[model samples]
Target: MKAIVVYLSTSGNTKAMAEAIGNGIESKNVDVQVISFYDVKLDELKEAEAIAVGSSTFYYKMLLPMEKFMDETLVASNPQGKIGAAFGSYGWSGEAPILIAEKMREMGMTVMDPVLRILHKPTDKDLQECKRLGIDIAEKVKHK
Candidate 1:
Protein backbone atom coordinates (compact mmCIF):
# COMPACT_ATOMS: atom_id res chain seq x y z
CA MET A 1 0.00 0.00 0.00
CA LYS A 2 0.98 3.65 -0.14
CA ALA A 3 0.60 4.89 3.44
CA ILE A 4 -0.91 3.48 6.62
CA VAL A 5 -1.82 5.19 9.88
CA VAL A 6 -2.87 3.00 12.78
CA TYR A 7 -3.62 4.52 16.15
CA LEU A 8 -4.92 3.74 19.62
CA SER A 9 -6.61 6.57 21.46
CA THR A 10 -8.25 6.68 24.82
CA SER A 11 -10.23 9.85 25.67
CA GLY A 12 -9.90 10.83 22.03
CA ASN A 13 -6.69 12.85 22.32
CA THR A 14 -4.40 10.57 20.33
CA LYS A 15 -7.01 10.10 17.63
CA ALA A 16 -6.85 13.81 16.92
CA MET A 17 -3.09 13.51 16.69
CA ALA A 18 -3.57 10.77 14.13
CA GLU A 19 -5.89 13.04 12.15
CA ALA A 20 -3.47 15.95 12.06
CA ILE A 21 -0.82 13.64 10.73
CA GLY A 22 -3.29 12.19 8.26
CA ASN A 23 -3.97 15.66 6.88
CA GLY A 24 -0.28 16.16 6.36
CA ILE A 25 -0.01 12.89 4.50
CA GLU A 26 -2.90 13.93 2.31
CA SER A 27 -1.12 17.19 1.50
CA LYS A 28 1.12 15.47 -1.00
CA ASN A 29 -1.86 13.82 -2.69
CA VAL A 30 -0.69 10.41 -1.56
CA ASP A 31 -3.37 7.87 -0.81
CA VAL A 32 -3.40 6.94 2.86
CA GLN A 33 -5.17 4.29 4.89
CA VAL A 34 -6.29 5.29 8.38
CA ILE A 35 -7.57 2.76 10.89
CA SER A 36 -7.95 2.20 14.56
CA PHE A 37 -6.09 -0.56 16.35
CA TYR A 38 -9.43 -2.23 16.85
CA ASP A 39 -9.94 -2.51 13.13
CA VAL A 40 -6.41 -2.87 11.82
CA LYS A 41 -5.55 -5.98 9.90
CA LEU A 42 -1.95 -7.13 10.07
CA ASP A 43 -2.19 -8.42 6.55
CA GLU A 44 -2.84 -4.90 5.32
CA LEU A 45 -0.46 -3.36 7.82
CA LYS A 46 2.55 -5.41 6.77
CA GLU A 47 2.26 -4.43 3.12
CA ALA A 48 2.57 -0.71 3.63
CA GLU A 49 5.88 1.10 3.13
CA ALA A 50 4.82 4.24 4.99
CA ILE A 51 3.56 3.35 8.44
CA ALA A 52 2.82 5.80 11.22
CA VAL A 53 1.44 4.88 14.60
CA GLY A 54 0.01 7.18 17.29
CA SER A 55 -1.02 5.77 20.62
CA SER A 56 -2.07 7.51 23.79
CA THR A 57 0.49 7.32 26.53
CA PHE A 58 -0.37 5.81 29.86
CA TYR A 59 2.14 5.93 32.69
CA TYR A 60 4.92 6.75 30.23
CA LYS A 61 4.02 3.81 28.02
CA MET A 62 1.65 2.78 25.31
CA LEU A 63 -1.50 0.75 25.74
CA LEU A 64 -0.90 -2.99 25.81
CA PRO A 65 -2.49 -3.62 22.46
CA MET A 66 -0.39 -0.95 20.83
CA GLU A 67 2.70 -2.42 22.38
CA LYS A 68 1.84 -5.75 20.83
CA PHE A 69 1.38 -4.25 17.38
CA MET A 70 4.63 -2.33 17.40
CA ASP A 71 6.73 -4.68 19.46
CA GLU A 72 5.60 -8.04 18.21
CA THR A 73 3.35 -7.91 15.18
CA LEU A 74 5.46 -5.43 13.26
CA VAL A 75 8.60 -7.39 13.91
CA ALA A 76 7.00 -10.70 13.09
CA SER A 77 5.97 -9.30 9.73
CA ASN A 78 9.54 -8.63 8.69
CA PRO A 79 9.66 -4.87 8.28
CA GLN A 80 12.05 -3.45 5.71
CA GLY A 81 12.18 -0.62 3.21
CA LYS A 82 9.62 1.02 5.41
CA ILE A 83 9.53 4.67 6.41
CA GLY A 84 7.99 4.65 9.85
CA ALA A 85 7.35 7.17 12.61
CA ALA A 86 5.77 7.28 16.03
CA PHE A 87 3.65 9.94 17.74
CA GLY A 88 1.32 10.30 20.69
CA SER A 89 -0.41 12.56 23.22
CA TYR A 90 -0.29 12.10 26.94
CA GLY A 91 -1.41 13.73 30.15
CA TRP A 92 1.67 12.94 32.14
CA SER A 93 5.30 12.96 30.96
CA GLY A 94 5.70 12.26 27.27
CA GLU A 95 7.78 9.18 26.56
CA ALA A 96 5.50 6.77 24.73
CA PRO A 97 6.31 7.97 21.24
CA ILE A 98 10.03 7.71 21.78
CA LEU A 99 9.67 4.02 22.49
CA ILE A 100 7.87 3.51 19.24
CA ALA A 101 10.52 5.35 17.21
CA GLU A 102 13.20 3.33 18.89
CA LYS A 103 11.28 0.21 18.06
CA MET A 104 10.96 1.35 14.47
CA ARG A 105 14.72 1.59 14.19
CA GLU A 106 15.25 -1.73 15.87
CA MET A 107 12.75 -3.34 13.55
CA GLY A 108 14.77 -2.05 10.60
CA MET A 109 12.28 0.45 9.22
CA THR A 110 13.83 3.72 8.09
CA VAL A 111 12.57 5.78 10.99
CA MET A 112 12.17 9.50 11.44
CA ASP A 113 14.18 11.16 14.13
CA PRO A 114 12.93 12.69 17.39
CA VAL A 115 9.43 11.31 17.73
CA LEU A 116 6.38 13.54 18.37
CA ARG A 117 4.74 13.76 21.76
CA ILE A 118 2.19 16.25 23.10
CA LEU A 119 0.72 16.77 26.52
CA HIS A 120 -3.01 16.48 27.12
CA LYS A 121 -4.80 18.21 24.30
CA PRO A 122 -2.66 19.38 21.44
CA THR A 123 -2.21 23.09 20.78
CA ASP A 124 -2.25 24.64 17.30
CA LYS A 125 1.52 24.48 17.27
CA ASP A 126 1.42 20.82 18.23
CA LEU A 127 -1.09 20.03 15.52
CA GLN A 128 1.05 21.73 12.93
CA GLU A 129 4.10 19.83 14.02
CA CYS A 130 2.18 16.57 13.78
CA LYS A 131 1.00 17.54 10.33
CA ARG A 132 4.55 18.21 9.32
CA LEU A 133 5.40 14.78 10.71
CA GLY A 134 2.66 13.36 8.53
CA ILE A 135 4.05 15.12 5.48
CA ASP A 136 7.46 13.77 6.24
CA ILE A 137 6.24 10.19 6.58
CA ALA A 138 4.37 10.19 3.28
CA GLU A 139 6.89 12.32 1.45
CA LYS A 140 9.66 9.92 2.41
CA VAL A 141 8.20 6.62 1.25
CA LYS A 142 5.25 6.88 -1.08
CA HIS A 143 5.49 6.20 -4.80
CA LYS A 144 5.10 9.30 -6.94
Candidate 2:
Protein backbone atom coordinates (compact mmCIF):
# COMPACT_ATOMS: atom_id res chain seq x y z
CA MET A 1 0.00 0.00 0.00
CA LYS A 2 0.97 3.60 -0.48
CA ALA A 3 0.99 6.33 2.16
CA ILE A 4 1.65 10.02 1.68
CA VAL A 5 2.88 12.58 4.17
CA VAL A 6 2.34 16.18 3.11
CA TYR A 7 3.86 18.71 5.45
CA LEU A 8 4.87 22.33 5.97
CA SER A 9 7.90 23.12 8.05
CA THR A 10 9.55 26.40 8.93
CA SER A 11 11.98 25.38 11.68
CA GLY A 12 12.56 22.02 9.99
CA ASN A 13 11.32 20.26 13.11
CA THR A 14 8.16 19.01 11.47
CA LYS A 15 10.11 17.96 8.41
CA ALA A 16 12.32 15.83 10.61
CA MET A 17 9.27 14.19 12.14
CA ALA A 18 7.84 13.56 8.70
CA GLU A 19 10.98 11.77 7.63
CA ALA A 20 10.96 9.65 10.77
CA ILE A 21 7.33 8.74 10.26
CA GLY A 22 7.92 7.91 6.62
CA ASN A 23 10.79 5.66 7.61
CA GLY A 24 8.56 3.81 10.04
CA ILE A 25 5.88 3.35 7.41
CA GLU A 26 8.39 2.10 4.90
CA SER A 27 9.61 -0.39 7.50
CA LYS A 28 6.20 -1.99 7.31
CA ASN A 29 6.89 -2.69 3.64
CA VAL A 30 4.60 0.06 2.51
CA ASP A 31 5.36 2.73 -0.05
CA VAL A 32 5.55 6.00 1.84
CA GLN A 33 6.20 9.33 0.22
CA VAL A 34 7.13 12.33 2.33
CA ILE A 35 6.69 15.58 0.45
CA SER A 36 6.51 19.23 1.24
CA PHE A 37 3.19 20.96 0.96
CA TYR A 38 4.56 23.04 -1.90
CA ASP A 39 5.40 19.94 -3.97
CA VAL A 40 2.28 17.94 -3.23
CA LYS A 41 -0.52 17.42 -5.69
CA LEU A 42 -4.02 16.70 -4.42
CA ASP A 43 -4.31 14.04 -7.08
CA GLU A 44 -1.26 12.22 -5.81
CA LEU A 45 -2.67 12.04 -2.30
CA LYS A 46 -5.98 10.78 -3.61
CA GLU A 47 -4.18 7.77 -4.99
CA ALA A 48 -2.54 6.87 -1.70
CA GLU A 49 -4.08 4.34 0.68
CA ALA A 50 -3.06 6.37 3.72
CA ILE A 51 -2.44 10.08 4.27
CA ALA A 52 -0.65 12.05 6.97
CA VAL A 53 -0.44 15.82 7.36
CA GLY A 54 2.01 17.70 9.53
CA SER A 55 3.06 21.25 10.30
CA SER A 56 5.06 23.37 12.68
CA THR A 57 2.89 25.44 14.93
CA PHE A 58 2.99 29.21 14.49
CA TYR A 59 1.33 31.36 17.15
CA TYR A 60 -0.88 28.52 18.41
CA LYS A 61 -2.01 27.46 14.94
CA MET A 62 -0.64 25.89 11.80
CA LEU A 63 1.45 27.93 9.38
CA LEU A 64 -0.66 29.90 6.91
CA PRO A 65 0.61 27.93 3.94
CA MET A 66 -0.18 24.59 5.53
CA GLU A 67 -3.60 25.81 6.53
CA LYS A 68 -4.16 27.04 3.02
CA PHE A 69 -3.03 23.77 1.50
CA MET A 70 -5.48 21.83 3.67
CA ASP A 71 -8.23 24.23 2.82
CA GLU A 72 -7.69 23.97 -0.90
CA THR A 73 -6.56 20.38 -1.24
CA LEU A 74 -8.33 18.30 1.40
CA VAL A 75 -11.67 20.03 1.31
CA ALA A 76 -11.77 20.01 -2.44
CA SER A 77 -10.96 16.35 -2.75
CA ASN A 78 -13.14 15.09 0.14
CA PRO A 79 -11.81 11.56 0.24
CA GLN A 80 -14.08 9.40 2.35
CA GLY A 81 -12.94 7.19 5.25
CA LYS A 82 -9.28 7.08 4.31
CA ILE A 83 -6.87 6.07 7.06
CA GLY A 84 -4.91 9.20 8.05
CA ALA A 85 -3.00 11.07 10.72
CA ALA A 86 -1.95 14.56 11.77
CA PHE A 87 1.19 15.55 13.61
CA GLY A 88 3.26 18.64 14.45
CA SER A 89 5.83 20.39 16.62
CA TYR A 90 4.87 23.36 18.71
CA GLY A 91 6.34 25.92 21.09
CA TRP A 92 3.25 26.95 22.97
CA SER A 93 -0.30 25.76 22.48
CA GLY A 94 -0.16 22.88 20.04
CA GLU A 95 -3.26 23.42 18.00
CA ALA A 96 -1.84 22.49 14.64
CA PRO A 97 -2.25 18.74 14.95
CA ILE A 98 -5.56 18.94 16.74
CA LEU A 99 -7.01 21.25 14.14
CA ILE A 100 -5.68 19.20 11.29
CA ALA A 101 -7.23 16.08 12.79
CA GLU A 102 -10.52 17.86 13.16
CA LYS A 103 -10.48 18.91 9.55
CA MET A 104 -9.54 15.43 8.36
CA ARG A 105 -12.39 13.93 10.36
CA GLU A 106 -14.73 16.55 9.02
CA MET A 107 -13.69 15.48 5.56
CA GLY A 108 -14.69 11.90 6.52
CA MET A 109 -11.21 10.52 7.10
CA THR A 110 -10.36 7.89 9.72
CA VAL A 111 -7.82 9.99 11.59
CA MET A 112 -5.43 8.27 13.96
CA ASP A 113 -6.09 9.28 17.53
CA PRO A 114 -4.62 11.84 19.89
CA VAL A 115 -2.68 13.42 17.03
CA LEU A 116 1.03 13.59 17.71
CA ARG A 117 2.10 16.92 19.18
CA ILE A 118 5.66 17.65 20.11
CA LEU A 119 7.29 20.64 21.75
CA HIS A 120 9.37 23.32 19.98
CA LYS A 121 11.76 20.73 18.65
CA PRO A 122 11.38 17.01 18.44
CA THR A 123 13.72 14.93 20.55
CA ASP A 124 14.75 11.39 19.62
CA LYS A 125 12.04 10.10 21.92
CA ASP A 126 9.42 12.31 20.32
CA LEU A 127 10.43 11.13 16.89
CA GLN A 128 10.23 7.54 18.04
CA GLU A 129 6.60 8.14 18.87
CA CYS A 130 6.09 9.62 15.45
CA LYS A 131 7.50 6.49 13.94
CA ARG A 132 5.12 4.40 16.03
CA LEU A 133 2.25 6.45 14.70
CA GLY A 134 3.43 5.74 11.19
CA ILE A 135 3.63 2.05 11.86
CA ASP A 136 0.15 2.11 13.30
CA ILE A 137 -1.18 3.81 10.21
CA ALA A 138 0.61 1.37 7.95
CA GLU A 139 -0.73 -1.63 9.83
CA LYS A 140 -4.27 -0.29 9.76
CA VAL A 141 -4.21 0.18 6.03
CA LYS A 142 -3.49 -3.52 5.58
CA HIS A 143 -6.77 -4.39 7.25
CA LYS A 144 -8.81 -1.46 6.07
Candidate 3:
Protein backbone atom coordinates (compact mmCIF):
# COMPACT_ATOMS: atom_id res chain seq x y z
CA MET A 1 0.00 0.00 0.00
CA LYS A 2 1.01 3.57 -0.54
CA ALA A 3 0.41 6.57 1.72
CA ILE A 4 1.11 10.24 1.20
CA VAL A 5 1.78 12.67 4.00
CA VAL A 6 1.56 16.34 3.07
CA TYR A 7 1.97 19.18 5.50
CA LEU A 8 2.35 22.96 5.65
CA SER A 9 4.52 24.39 8.38
CA THR A 10 5.81 27.89 8.96
CA SER A 11 7.85 27.03 12.08
CA GLY A 12 8.57 23.41 11.06
CA ASN A 13 6.56 21.82 13.85
CA THR A 14 4.04 20.19 11.55
CA LYS A 15 6.80 19.08 9.22
CA ALA A 16 8.43 17.18 12.05
CA MET A 17 5.14 15.47 12.84
CA ALA A 18 4.72 14.55 9.21
CA GLU A 19 8.14 12.97 9.18
CA ALA A 20 7.39 10.97 12.29
CA ILE A 21 4.20 9.70 10.75
CA GLY A 22 6.04 8.77 7.58
CA ASN A 23 8.50 6.80 9.61
CA GLY A 24 5.70 4.86 11.22
CA ILE A 25 4.19 4.11 7.87
CA GLU A 26 7.54 2.83 6.72
CA SER A 27 7.79 0.64 9.79
CA LYS A 28 4.55 -1.00 8.78
CA ASN A 29 6.22 -1.97 5.52
CA VAL A 30 4.08 0.37 3.50
CA ASP A 31 5.30 2.69 0.81
CA VAL A 32 4.94 6.33 1.87
CA GLN A 33 5.85 9.71 0.55
CA VAL A 34 6.25 12.88 2.62
CA ILE A 35 6.09 16.30 1.07
CA SER A 36 5.14 19.87 1.73
CA PHE A 37 1.72 21.11 0.69
CA TYR A 38 3.27 23.32 -1.93
CA ASP A 39 5.13 20.36 -3.42
CA VAL A 40 2.19 18.01 -3.72
CA LYS A 41 0.82 17.35 -7.19
CA LEU A 42 -2.41 15.98 -8.60
CA ASP A 43 -0.76 12.81 -9.80
CA GLU A 44 0.61 12.08 -6.36
CA LEU A 45 -2.84 12.44 -4.87
CA LYS A 46 -4.26 10.21 -7.55
CA GLU A 47 -1.78 7.43 -6.75
CA ALA A 48 -2.06 7.46 -2.98
CA GLU A 49 -4.09 4.84 -1.14
CA ALA A 50 -4.04 6.93 2.00
CA ILE A 51 -3.64 10.67 2.30
CA ALA A 52 -2.61 12.53 5.43
CA VAL A 53 -2.88 16.31 5.63
CA GLY A 54 -1.39 18.47 8.37
CA SER A 55 -0.80 22.12 9.05
CA SER A 56 0.13 24.55 11.77
CA THR A 57 -3.03 26.05 13.11
CA PHE A 58 -3.38 29.79 12.97
CA TYR A 59 -6.16 31.49 14.91
CA TYR A 60 -8.18 28.30 15.36
CA LYS A 61 -7.96 27.51 11.64
CA MET A 62 -5.59 25.99 9.13
CA LEU A 63 -3.00 28.19 7.49
CA LEU A 64 -4.35 29.92 4.43
CA PRO A 65 -2.09 28.02 2.05
CA MET A 66 -3.25 24.67 3.41
CA GLU A 67 -6.89 25.62 3.05
CA LYS A 68 -6.16 26.74 -0.47
CA PHE A 69 -4.29 23.54 -1.26
CA MET A 70 -7.21 21.41 -0.13
CA ASP A 71 -9.70 23.56 -2.00
CA GLU A 72 -7.79 23.35 -5.24
CA THR A 73 -6.61 19.74 -5.18
CA LEU A 74 -9.61 17.95 -3.74
CA VAL A 75 -12.03 19.71 -6.02
CA ALA A 76 -10.31 18.10 -8.99
CA SER A 77 -10.19 14.52 -7.76
CA ASN A 78 -12.36 11.76 -6.43
CA PRO A 79 -11.22 10.56 -3.00
CA GLN A 80 -13.81 7.93 -2.27
CA GLY A 81 -12.43 4.79 -0.53
CA LYS A 82 -9.21 6.60 0.28
CA ILE A 83 -8.14 6.80 3.91
CA GLY A 84 -7.85 10.43 4.98
CA ALA A 85 -6.32 11.70 8.20
CA ALA A 86 -5.52 15.11 9.68
CA PHE A 87 -2.97 16.42 12.14
CA GLY A 88 -1.57 19.79 13.15
CA SER A 89 0.09 21.98 15.75
CA TYR A 90 -1.96 24.55 17.62
CA GLY A 91 -1.29 27.48 19.88
CA TRP A 92 -4.53 27.73 21.88
CA SER A 93 -7.39 26.24 19.92
CA GLY A 94 -6.93 22.79 18.39
CA GLU A 95 -9.52 23.11 15.70
CA ALA A 96 -7.62 22.68 12.46
CA PRO A 97 -7.59 18.89 12.50
CA ILE A 98 -11.33 18.66 13.03
CA LEU A 99 -12.05 21.14 10.28
CA ILE A 100 -9.70 19.42 7.86
CA ALA A 101 -11.20 16.01 8.57
CA GLU A 102 -14.70 17.39 8.10
CA LYS A 103 -13.70 18.94 4.83
CA MET A 104 -12.23 15.63 3.70
CA ARG A 105 -15.48 13.88 4.53
CA GLU A 106 -17.39 16.48 2.58
CA MET A 107 -15.16 15.77 -0.40
CA GLY A 108 -15.99 12.04 -0.35
CA MET A 109 -12.95 10.80 1.56
CA THR A 110 -13.18 8.28 4.36
CA VAL A 111 -11.63 10.11 7.26
CA MET A 112 -9.72 8.30 9.96
CA ASP A 113 -10.70 8.90 13.57
CA PRO A 114 -9.03 10.93 16.36
CA VAL A 115 -7.29 13.80 14.65
CA LEU A 116 -3.81 14.52 15.99
CA ARG A 117 -3.22 17.96 17.52
CA ILE A 118 -0.07 19.11 19.22
CA LEU A 119 1.22 22.31 20.74
CA HIS A 120 3.95 24.56 19.32
CA LYS A 121 6.67 22.02 19.90
CA PRO A 122 5.62 18.45 20.18
CA THR A 123 6.86 16.24 22.97
CA ASP A 124 8.39 12.81 22.34
CA LYS A 125 5.12 11.27 23.44
CA ASP A 126 3.20 13.37 20.98
CA LEU A 127 5.49 12.30 18.19
CA GLN A 128 4.98 8.67 19.14
CA GLU A 129 1.25 9.17 19.04
CA CYS A 130 1.56 10.63 15.60
CA LYS A 131 3.52 7.58 14.53
CA ARG A 132 0.87 5.32 16.01
CA LEU A 133 -1.78 7.12 14.01
CA GLY A 134 0.24 6.53 10.87
CA ILE A 135 0.63 2.88 11.67
CA ASP A 136 -3.09 2.54 12.21
CA ILE A 137 -3.83 4.17 8.92
CA ALA A 138 -1.29 2.09 7.05
CA GLU A 139 -2.63 -1.09 8.54
CA LYS A 140 -6.10 -0.14 7.44
CA VAL A 141 -4.89 0.62 3.97
CA LYS A 142 -3.11 -2.70 3.71
CA HIS A 143 -6.27 -4.54 4.72
CA LYS A 144 -8.34 -2.62 2.26
Candidate 4:
Protein backbone atom coordinates (compact mmCIF):
# COMPACT_ATOMS: atom_id res chain seq x y z
CA MET A 1 0.00 0.00 0.00
CA LYS A 2 1.16 3.53 -0.68
CA ALA A 3 1.31 6.02 2.16
CA ILE A 4 2.05 9.70 1.84
CA VAL A 5 3.10 12.13 4.54
CA VAL A 6 2.86 15.82 3.80
CA TYR A 7 3.80 18.62 6.18
CA LEU A 8 4.79 22.24 6.62
CA SER A 9 7.34 23.26 9.20
CA THR A 10 8.72 26.69 9.83
CA SER A 11 10.90 25.72 12.80
CA GLY A 12 11.85 22.26 11.58
CA ASN A 13 9.94 20.55 14.39
CA THR A 14 7.00 19.37 12.30
CA LYS A 15 9.24 18.28 9.45
CA ALA A 16 11.17 16.12 11.87
CA MET A 17 7.98 14.47 13.02
CA ALA A 18 6.96 13.87 9.43
CA GLU A 19 10.25 12.21 8.68
CA ALA A 20 9.99 10.02 11.73
CA ILE A 21 6.56 8.88 10.72
CA GLY A 22 7.76 8.15 7.21
CA ASN A 23 10.71 6.22 8.56
CA GLY A 24 8.40 4.20 10.75
CA ILE A 25 6.14 3.33 7.87
CA GLU A 26 8.98 2.58 5.49
CA SER A 27 10.56 0.23 8.01
CA LYS A 28 7.56 -2.01 7.63
CA ASN A 29 7.89 -2.25 3.83
CA VAL A 30 5.18 0.25 3.16
CA ASP A 31 5.70 2.45 0.13
CA VAL A 32 5.95 5.71 1.99
CA GLN A 33 6.61 9.17 0.62
CA VAL A 34 7.24 12.32 2.65
CA ILE A 35 6.80 15.68 1.00
CA SER A 36 6.84 19.25 2.06
CA PHE A 37 3.46 20.85 1.49
CA TYR A 38 5.02 23.26 -0.95
CA ASP A 39 6.35 20.49 -3.13
CA VAL A 40 3.49 18.02 -3.26
CA LYS A 41 0.24 18.33 -5.11
CA LEU A 42 -3.06 17.30 -3.56
CA ASP A 43 -3.57 14.87 -6.40
CA GLU A 44 -0.49 13.00 -5.25
CA LEU A 45 -2.12 12.47 -1.91
CA LYS A 46 -5.33 11.27 -3.51
CA GLU A 47 -3.51 8.26 -4.90
CA ALA A 48 -2.24 7.02 -1.60
CA GLU A 49 -4.02 4.48 0.57
CA ALA A 50 -3.09 6.54 3.61
CA ILE A 51 -2.39 10.22 3.96
CA ALA A 52 -0.76 11.67 7.09
CA VAL A 53 -0.55 15.39 7.60
CA GLY A 54 1.62 17.20 10.12
CA SER A 55 2.38 20.76 11.01
CA SER A 56 3.47 23.04 13.83
CA THR A 57 0.62 24.58 15.72
CA PHE A 58 0.27 28.33 15.68
CA TYR A 59 -1.61 30.13 18.41
CA TYR A 60 -3.94 27.16 19.04
CA LYS A 61 -4.60 26.77 15.35
CA MET A 62 -3.17 24.91 12.42
CA LEU A 63 -0.25 26.70 10.80
CA LEU A 64 -1.30 29.10 8.10
CA PRO A 65 0.21 27.17 5.20
CA MET A 66 -1.27 23.93 6.46
CA GLU A 67 -4.65 25.53 6.81
CA LYS A 68 -4.37 26.96 3.34
CA PHE A 69 -3.24 23.72 1.81
CA MET A 70 -6.01 21.71 3.38
CA ASP A 71 -8.65 24.23 2.53
CA GLU A 72 -7.60 24.42 -1.06
CA THR A 73 -6.93 20.75 -1.56
CA LEU A 74 -9.87 19.35 0.29
CA VAL A 75 -12.22 21.81 -1.28
CA ALA A 76 -11.30 20.50 -4.67
CA SER A 77 -11.37 16.82 -3.77
CA ASN A 78 -12.25 14.33 -1.06
CA PRO A 79 -10.42 11.48 0.62
CA GLN A 80 -13.35 9.21 1.33
CA GLY A 81 -12.39 5.69 2.42
CA LYS A 82 -8.72 6.51 2.54
CA ILE A 83 -6.99 6.28 5.90
CA GLY A 84 -6.22 9.67 7.41
CA ALA A 85 -4.19 10.69 10.44
CA ALA A 86 -2.51 13.70 11.95
CA PHE A 87 0.75 14.56 13.68
CA GLY A 88 2.09 17.91 14.75
CA SER A 89 4.39 19.82 17.08
CA TYR A 90 3.57 22.50 19.59
CA GLY A 91 5.22 24.57 22.25
CA TRP A 92 2.41 23.76 24.67
CA SER A 93 -0.51 21.40 24.81
CA GLY A 94 -1.62 20.71 21.26
CA GLU A 95 -5.28 20.55 20.40
CA ALA A 96 -4.80 21.23 16.72
CA PRO A 97 -3.79 17.74 15.61
CA ILE A 98 -6.95 16.19 16.96
CA LEU A 99 -8.86 18.97 15.32
CA ILE A 100 -7.07 18.01 12.17
CA ALA A 101 -8.29 14.44 12.48
CA GLU A 102 -11.85 15.61 12.97
CA LYS A 103 -11.59 17.83 9.96
CA MET A 104 -10.25 14.92 7.95
CA ARG A 105 -13.18 12.83 9.10
CA GLU A 106 -15.47 15.57 7.98
CA MET A 107 -13.75 15.37 4.64
CA GLY A 108 -14.74 11.68 4.62
CA MET A 109 -11.48 9.99 5.54
CA THR A 110 -10.92 7.19 7.99
CA VAL A 111 -8.42 8.09 10.66
CA MET A 112 -5.99 5.43 11.73
CA ASP A 113 -4.93 6.09 15.23
CA PRO A 114 -2.30 6.60 17.89
CA VAL A 115 -2.53 10.26 16.87
CA LEU A 116 0.85 11.85 17.61
CA ARG A 117 1.61 15.06 19.43
CA ILE A 118 5.05 16.41 20.18
CA LEU A 119 6.68 19.33 21.88
CA HIS A 120 9.32 21.54 20.30
CA LYS A 121 11.08 18.40 19.25
CA PRO A 122 10.20 14.77 19.07
CA THR A 123 11.39 12.52 21.85
CA ASP A 124 12.42 8.88 21.43
CA LYS A 125 9.04 7.86 22.71
CA ASP A 126 7.38 10.09 20.18
CA LEU A 127 9.37 8.51 17.36
CA GLN A 128 8.40 5.02 18.42
CA GLU A 129 4.78 5.93 18.67
CA CYS A 130 4.85 7.55 15.25
CA LYS A 131 6.37 4.41 13.86
CA ARG A 132 3.79 2.26 15.56
CA LEU A 133 0.99 4.30 14.10
CA GLY A 134 2.55 4.19 10.65
CA ILE A 135 3.02 0.45 10.84
CA ASP A 136 -0.53 -0.03 11.95
CA ILE A 137 -1.88 2.05 9.10
CA ALA A 138 0.20 0.15 6.60
CA GLU A 139 -0.95 -3.18 7.90
CA LYS A 140 -4.54 -2.12 7.78
CA VAL A 141 -4.21 -1.12 4.14
CA LYS A 142 -2.35 -4.27 3.25
CA HIS A 143 -4.93 -6.55 4.76
CA LYS A 144 -7.91 -4.69 3.48
Top of the candidates by lDDT:
3
lDDT agreement with native, every candidate = 0.82, 0.88, 0.89, 0.82
- Ten contiguous residues with the weakest lDDT in model 3: 72-81
Q: How high is each candidate's TM-score?
A: 0.90, 0.96, 0.96, 0.93
lDDT of 4 by residue, 1-144 (tens): 688998888888888888888887888888989999899876788778888988787888887877888878854656888888898888886877887888888888888776788888778887777778777877877887
- Model 3: colliding residue pairs: none
Could you give candidate 3's per-residue lDDT for residues 16-61 as a string of tens digits? Answer: 9999999989999999999998988898998899999999888879
Candidate 1 lDDT, 35-112, residue by residue in tens = 897887778777777888888878878889999877777787677767888888987787788888888888888877
Overall local distance difference test of candidate 3 = 0.89
> Per-residue lDDT of 1-144 in model 2, one digit per residue for the tens?
789988899879999999999988988998889999999888888888889999987887888998888888877766787887999888888899999999888889989875898887888998899899888888988877
Angstrom error at residue 49, model 2: 1.2
Which prediction has the highest TM-score against the true structure?
3
Q: Cα deviation in Å at residue 2, candidate 1?
A: 0.8
